[PDB]
Design a protein around this ligand. Sequence first.
Ligand code: HG
Ligand code: ZN
Length: 255
Amino acid sequence: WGYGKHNGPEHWHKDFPIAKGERQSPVDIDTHTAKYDPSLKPLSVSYDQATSLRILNNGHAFNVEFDDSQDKAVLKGGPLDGTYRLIQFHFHWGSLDGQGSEHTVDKKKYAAELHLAHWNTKYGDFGKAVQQPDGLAVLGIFLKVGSAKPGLQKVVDVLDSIKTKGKSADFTNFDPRGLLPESLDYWTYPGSLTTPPLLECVTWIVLKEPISVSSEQVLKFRKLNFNGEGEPEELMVDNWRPAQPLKNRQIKASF
Ligand SMILES: [Hg+2]
Ligand SMILES: [Zn+2]
């Protein structure tokens, strides 16, 4: 699988039949159809004690991994029941600024989309939670081109180091709080992972308010490679999946 003409999202169903499931992600968020639910509690992000370990290029994106042996960086409240631990974060970007995000808003596509993956700590480990309907919690944040994001420069600088597939780099003392918008207003719905195995275990939380990053920050993302060192060079762009049918599911709003 990949995002190429021959291995793209339109071919995933072949190896991952769930691709055509009932709670597939990403989706289009119709703001006029989303339902204001007053029983929704405010989001609770506790990332003051976070511990980043490394940055890796897995051939489809770059992941910033965290130590999840303890409740260092946790997500609770909102639509969630119990505590979710931050395992990693990554992005999805496009070739141009008109595309990149996975979720859309009234059909509108952003430059990129940031995903912070969490797993329910009653299941004990990541591998076990992916076997549960409420196993994961993904915090989605849209990225628009404007002013630089100071809190994001550190990631940008280390990309040169992990240009190709398989490369990894030590990445400690990175505070994720720097990637968060002012507002914690969100939309929530039952979905899946947007990449294979596409397991239908995710509780999506997409923030209304986007973060802006500079043209130059975003440009460095696009210099990454899908291919491994020594192979023909294939630029890492458009690593996003097209919106899926909501199919009965209802999108709730915290605002
Ligand atoms: Hg699941
Ligand atoms: Zn993602």
